């Protein structure tokens, strides 16, 4: 039989395999839909199929940095094993948005792929836009397998949204965001620093932007009172340990409510739209005022300069 190899999906490779011999002899550690077949021989109906292999060869090698933008070789087989499980969740549409049925603790992938459809983000890696883009489209297997081998998670590992958001904002391009801070102490007095890209867009402390603007209390080498100065990011992500915090329709996006205790815990996702929503995987219910244990806050910006 004839089948196609390929490290992307895009440039596919005739191959004359031998039928008496496992894939493993041949063409090295290869995959099929994420079910790893390195230790099978080819079936009949496997005939003209496209399967997965670990680069062997520098063309693949490169074909492989150009889809992905990693060289680690343990990522293919990775993101193959988490497909092998992710491709057989449910990705409802609920409010509109491409949601996930709870399964193997989903809970933080579920709220990280809810935000990424609300936010603005271009992906560097090939594999992130292309699968980004069939994901909002309704089909998000591919999407949320990459997720998990960009973050280094496996299928049934606890997840931090946070976390997760870091890591992907790392492949997106933010090249061209910027955050000035001005810090000021009783007797250091004044400084400013600059910060790009995703350092820009996260702060860990506090989930109201407003306060942000107003500032908040950070020590110094020597207890002052950071500000926010200018933001130049098309959202921010506002977050902070689990509190009670009220959420009032129409003055942020949407947000990561996390319950239970520190890990072992589940996040639901709540988006402003005309009312607000909560989004629990595969459930949704609606009210006009929500008032609960809120971990991460999600803000539209475009350009904001302070009037201090
Ligand atoms: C940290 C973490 C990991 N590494 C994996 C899965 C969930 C969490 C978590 O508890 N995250 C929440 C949002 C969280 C983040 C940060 C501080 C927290 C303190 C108490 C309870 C929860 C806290
Ligand atoms: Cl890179
Ligand atoms: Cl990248
Ligand atoms: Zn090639
Ligand atoms: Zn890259
Ligand atoms: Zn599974
Ligand atoms: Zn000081």
Redesign the pocket.
């Given at each position: 039989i004839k089948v196609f190899t390929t490290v992307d999906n895009i440039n596919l490779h005739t191959q004359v395999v031998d039928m008496s011999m496992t894939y493993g002899q041949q063409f090295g550690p290869t995959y099929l839909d994420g079910a790893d077949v390195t230790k099978i021989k080819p079936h009949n109906s496997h005939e003209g199929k496209t399967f997965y292999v670990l680069p062997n060869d520098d063309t693949l090698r490169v074909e492989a940095f150009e889809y992905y933008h990693t060289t680690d070789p343990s990522f293919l087989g990775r993101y193959m094993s988490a497909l092998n499980h992710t491709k057989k969740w449910k990705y409802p549409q609920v409010n509109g948005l491409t949601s996930i049925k709870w399964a193997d603790n989903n809970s933080?992938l579920a709220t990280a792929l809810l935000t990424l459809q609300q936010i603005e983000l271009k992906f560097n890696p090939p594999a992130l836009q292309d699968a980004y883009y069939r994901a909002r489209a309704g089909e998000a297997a591919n999407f949320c397998a990459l997720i998990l081998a960009y973050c280094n998670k496996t299928v049934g590992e606890?997840?931090?949204?946070?976390?997760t958001m870091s890591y992907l904002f790392q492949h997106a391009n933010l090249d061209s965001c910027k955050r000035v801070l001005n810090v000021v102490c009783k007797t250091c007095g004044q400084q400013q620093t600059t910060l790009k890209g995703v350092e820009a867009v996260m702060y860990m402390g506090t989930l109201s932007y407003e306060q942000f603007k107003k500032g908040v209390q950070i020590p110094c080498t020597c207890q002052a009172t950071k500000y926010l100065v200018q933001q130049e990011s098309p959202f921010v992500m506002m977050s902070a340990?689990?509190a009670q915090y009220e959420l009032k329709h129409g003055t942020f996006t949407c947000a990561?409510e996390?319950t239970g205790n520190?890990?072992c815990?589940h996040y639901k996702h709540i988006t402003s739209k005309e009312t607000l929503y909560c989004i629990d995987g595969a459930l949704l219910t609606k009210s006009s005022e929500y008032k609960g244990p809120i971990?991460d806050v999600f803000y539209k910006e475009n350009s904001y300069t302070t009037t201090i």
């Amino acid at each position: 039989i004839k089948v196609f190899t390929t490290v992307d999906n895009i440039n596919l490779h005739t191959q004359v395999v031998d039928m008496s011999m496992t894939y493993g002899q041949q063409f090295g550690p290869t995959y099929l839909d994420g079910a790893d077949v390195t230790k099978i021989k080819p079936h009949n109906s496997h005939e003209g199929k496209t399967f997965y292999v670990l680069p062997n060869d520098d063309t693949l090698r490169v074909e492989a940095f150009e889809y992905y933008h990693t060289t680690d070789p343990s990522f293919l087989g990775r993101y193959m094993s988490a497909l092998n499980h992710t491709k057989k969740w449910k990705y409802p549409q609920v409010n509109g948005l491409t949601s996930i049925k709870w399964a193997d603790n989903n809970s933080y992938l579920a709220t990280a792929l809810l935000t990424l459809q609300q936010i603005e983000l271009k992906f560097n890696p090939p594999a992130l836009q292309d699968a980004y883009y069939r994901a909002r489209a309704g089909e998000a297997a591919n999407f949320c397998a990459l997720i998990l081998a960009y973050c280094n998670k496996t299928v049934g590992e606890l997840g931090d949204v946070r976390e997760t958001m870091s890591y992907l904002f790392q492949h997106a391009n933010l090249d061209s965001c910027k955050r000035v801070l001005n810090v000021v102490c009783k007797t250091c007095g004044q400084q400013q620093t600059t910060l790009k890209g995703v350092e820009a867009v996260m702060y860990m402390g506090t989930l109201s932007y407003e306060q942000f603007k107003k500032g908040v209390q950070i020590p110094c080498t020597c207890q002052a009172t950071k500000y926010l100065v200018q933001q130049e990011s098309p959202f921010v992500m506002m977050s902070a340990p689990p509190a009670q915090y009220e959420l009032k329709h129409g003055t942020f996006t949407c947000a990561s409510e996390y319950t239970g205790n520190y890990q072992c815990g589940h996040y639901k996702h709540i988006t402003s739209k005309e009312t607000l929503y909560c989004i629990d995987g595969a459930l949704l219910t609606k009210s006009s005022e929500y008032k609960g244990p809120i971990t991460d806050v999600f803000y539209k910006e475009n350009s904001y300069t302070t009037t201090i």
